[PDB]
Amino acid sequence: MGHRTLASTPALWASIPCPRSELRLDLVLPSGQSFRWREQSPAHWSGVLADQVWTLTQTEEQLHCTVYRGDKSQASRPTPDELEAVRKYFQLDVTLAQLYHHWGSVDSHFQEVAQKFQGVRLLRQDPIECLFSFICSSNNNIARITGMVERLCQAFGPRLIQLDDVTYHGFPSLQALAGPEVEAHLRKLGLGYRARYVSASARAILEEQGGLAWLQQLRESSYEEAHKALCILPGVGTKVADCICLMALDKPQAVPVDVHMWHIAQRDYSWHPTAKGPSPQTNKELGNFFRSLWGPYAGWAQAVLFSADLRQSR
Ligand SMILES: O=C(Nc1ccc(I)cc1)N1CCC(n2c(=O)[nH]c3c(Br)cccc32)CC1
């Protein structure tokens, strides 16, 4: 079985109405939200959504989707149900045009970046995948996070399918990551101190917080409650808790502050603390600065600027 292109198997592609103004796969899938997507052919992005492999590509007005099923069933277009899982993952019910207008109307620098970086949306990620991917993100570059997440899934996620050279795994279950061998094994895969954070956080969610049920509860809770609750987990500080809140728990006002948002603040917003250096208090101020500027979807605005900085550094 090989990776499909819109050309190589036209009958196996289904279409979502979706202009490039609303979504640019090339500016979203490698922009450090999800670490699971690869451009395996020019303009074709392959990765795992909900334990199935997809390839996505786009024309001017359409998002084209194809799904590989690891069963013995005949190949077929995505069902309307499967298509809806893609629509929710890209949060296409949120119209980017109105947000881009608001952010540009209050912020000249954003206006400037936004011209070049259209269609940068926030993915709605699975909370487990989002939590453990960003535990892997601490003191780490995008290349090394992608590698660490890839090795974690290979080791502890179910094998789905092989396409050309690439073997795809689902994201590990809590049960898999709570296992007794996990920590040692993750240290062998170069996760370092993060190996223990993964094991201990999987055990803390299963044993103390009542499993997956908890992350659904946080999804339905306030930003303030969700952020506080996440911060009890080993390896989850303010930055990682904000990433999870923004990317998996529907808190669009979350502004994850680390060195990267500091660099944008100083370089592009001539910003200083009101200790001149990254601390809890100065990190909190910076987050409040961008919520005050951009409004209730501040974290979506940040995603645009992060997409730009990531692209313009390789
Ligand atoms: O912080 C995130 N992701 C993230 C994406 C969107 C939102 I909103 C919030 C966080 N992580 C993945 C990207 C990673 N990173 C680099 O390695 N270089 C970066 C540059 Br240049 C600039 C911004 C991040 C960078 C840091 C860890």
Residue numbers in the entry: 11 to 284, 288 to 327
Share the article's original sentences:
To further understand the precise function of this inhibitor, we here determined the X-ray crystal structure of human OGG1 in complex with TH5487, showing that it binds in the active site, in an opposite orientation from the natural substrate, with the iodophenyl tail of TH5487 occupying the place of the 8-oxoguanine base. Here, we observe the benzimidazolone core interacts with a lipophilic exo-site outside the active site, stabilized by Ile152 and Leu323 in addition to a π-stacking interaction with His270. Also, the carbonyl side group of TH5487 makes a hydrogen bond with the Ile152 α-amino backbone. Finally, the bromine atom of TH5487 makes a water-mediated interaction with the side chain of Ser326. This confirms the overall molecular mechanism of this class of inhibitors, where OGG1 adopts a closed conformation upon binding TH5487, thereby blocking OGG1 from accessing substrate DNA lesions in DNA and chromatin. We and others recently reported the first examples of cell active inhibitors targeting OGG1, and here we provide the first structural details of how TH5487 binds to the human enzyme. In particular, the affinity to albumin reported here, which cause more than 99% of the molecule to associate with plasma proteins is a challenge that must be solved for TH5487 to be useful for in vivo applications where OGG1 must be targeted over a long period of time to induce cell death and inhibit proliferation.
The base excision repair (BER) pathway, involving PARP1 and glycosylases such as 8-oxoguanine-DNA glycosylase 1 (OGG1), is repairing the vast majority of DNA lesions. The most common result of ROS DNA damage is the oxidation of guanine to 8-dihydro-7,8-oxoguanosine (8-oxodG) in DNA, repaired by OGG1. Since expression of the frequently mutated RAS oncogenes leads to the generation of ROS and oxidative DNA damage, we wanted to determine if OGG1, which initiates the BER process by recognizing and excising 8-oxodG, is important for the survival of transformed cells.
